[PDB]
Design a protein around this ligand. Structure first.
Ligand SMILES: N#Cc1ccc2c(-c3ccc(C(=O)O)cc3OCc3ccccc3)nn(C(=O)c3c(Cl)cccc3C(F)(F)F)c2c1
Lengths: 263, 262
């Protein structure tokens, strides 16, 4: 059991590290998506030809479109893993855990966090890309051939519901921390020190939601139930990769991604 | 939103109804499992199974053995569905929902509640059966052949973790109510009143856990995280039925029975 002032300090700590670790925050993404700004407008990719023009205009070749798009998501997921890893090191207590557990927490936690933060870059019509310089429409992603057409749509379905909770970055900073420090991951050696940290983070999240959304009844509980939707999306994604590996033997995963997905 | 006195009234209402709807409560099952009490008849191998049917006359095992046991779980699950249906009618607001939504909430909720309540009858060594008169060991279940051996064990693994929260019946009565009122079930026509009721139940559950477990920090959050463990087991269970349907044709019964068990 922690004191209110210590919980507020923990929330401020975590929000501060989240800003230092993730260059594209939800606040910035919403300013780009909402508009009313001439300096932040993204180039919109909605079909084959505008994708062609996008590489001319956005920048960061002998491949097929759905593959190039898919490989673009792998590259960005690797960057996201790197940012999530840097953030986790700042969670008080995380780096003091057993080394194998640290790896285990990251292995199972990064994807649930990736889809969480991807919701920030999404609205019902598409997703920001290339650090907010681009915007790729949902419809164009859904029209890609083979198994790649269905790849992004579950993420869009989650994002629409998750975004209806109206969380801001300071909420997400604590929520992401709660996800990483899950004591129910398979193969953890010392569940107890992980659960003590998560108990602190849950208290910080509870107080944060009460203060920042005082008129949003049971938001804490509603937010925890969204961790169920994350688990199912991760499973759905993993099964899709298995289909791609057995069909596209031309294609290859980044070693970091390769390791996360083993088991 | 709601006043503390009304949350305690809501909690008391659900407890009373839960006692009337479920004959074998967690308190009673724990008395039987611990030895804090007619000792229940133990099924631990093939031979004690034969004697159990002869002496107790189980209605779910009245064909090959692993199949009979599988079919026995289906019979009991169908009974549990009716008990859960009657309980849901007492949840304030439920019967005033659109009739199709009531059916949708029960349809998708009963499996999660069956597993939740199955944990009340389980310990790490086996499961109570036949309204507490029998006890089937975990080891005997794990030793059933073909896919039936691996059918039973996920339930025990969940039950062991879930039981470590040490909930009692007055906690579970509200938790069960919260599961039923999930506004994210597919095909719901009017989500708003469902989520309105769930907010009241969640408030009642939160206050219940702080009063009944004041030393158990963030138990509310931890119990909500178990709804992830439930959803994953239900999905896993469904996939196992598909595997039995596609391989075990020794399983088809009387067509009338098949309709009862659909
Ligand atoms: N190992 C394993 C195992 C232990 C128990 C069950 C039960 C059960 C659920 C509630 C109750 C209760 O008293 O409230 C008692 C139960 O068992 C009693 C019993 C009877 C005979 C033999 C062994 C046990 N259901 N079930 C299922 O398989 C199942 C589930 Cl969880 C969900 C949906 C459908 C099914 C089903 F269709 F397939 F049956 C169990 C598996």
């Amino acid at each position: 059991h922690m004191e209110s002032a210590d919980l507020r300090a923990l929330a401020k700590h975590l929000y501060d590290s989240y800003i230092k670790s993730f260059p594209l925050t939800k606040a910035k993404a919403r300013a780009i998506l909402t508009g009313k700004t001439t300096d932040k407008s993204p180039f919109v990719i909605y079909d084959m030809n505008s994708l062609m023009m996008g590489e001319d205009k956005i920048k960061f070749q002998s491949k097929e479109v759905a593959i190039r798009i898919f490989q673009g998501c792998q590259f960005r997921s690797v960057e996201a893993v790197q940012e999530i890893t840097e953030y986790a090191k700042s969670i008080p207590g995380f780096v003091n855990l057993d080394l194998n557990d640290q790896v285990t927490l990251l292995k199972y936690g990064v994807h649930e966090i990736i889809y969480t933060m991807l919701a920030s870059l999404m609205n019902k019509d598409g997703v920001l890309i290339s650090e907010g310089q681009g915007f790729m429409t949902r419809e164009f992603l859904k029209s890609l051939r083979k198994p790649f057409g269905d790849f992004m749509e579950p993420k869009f379905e989650f994002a629409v519901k998750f975004n209806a909770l109206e969380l801001d970055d300071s909420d997400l900073a604590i929520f992401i921390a709660v996800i990483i420090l899950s004591g129910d991951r398979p193969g953890l050696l010392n569940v107890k020190p992980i659960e003590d940290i998560q108990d602190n983070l849950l208290q910080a999240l509870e107080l944060q939601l009460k203060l920042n959304h005082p008129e949003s009844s049971q938001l804490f509980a509603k937010l925890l139930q969204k961790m169920t939707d994350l688990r199912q999306i991760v499973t759905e994604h993993v099964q899709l990769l298995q289909v791609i590996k057995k069909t596209e033997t031309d294609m290859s995963l980044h070693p970091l991604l390769q390791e996360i997905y083993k088991d």
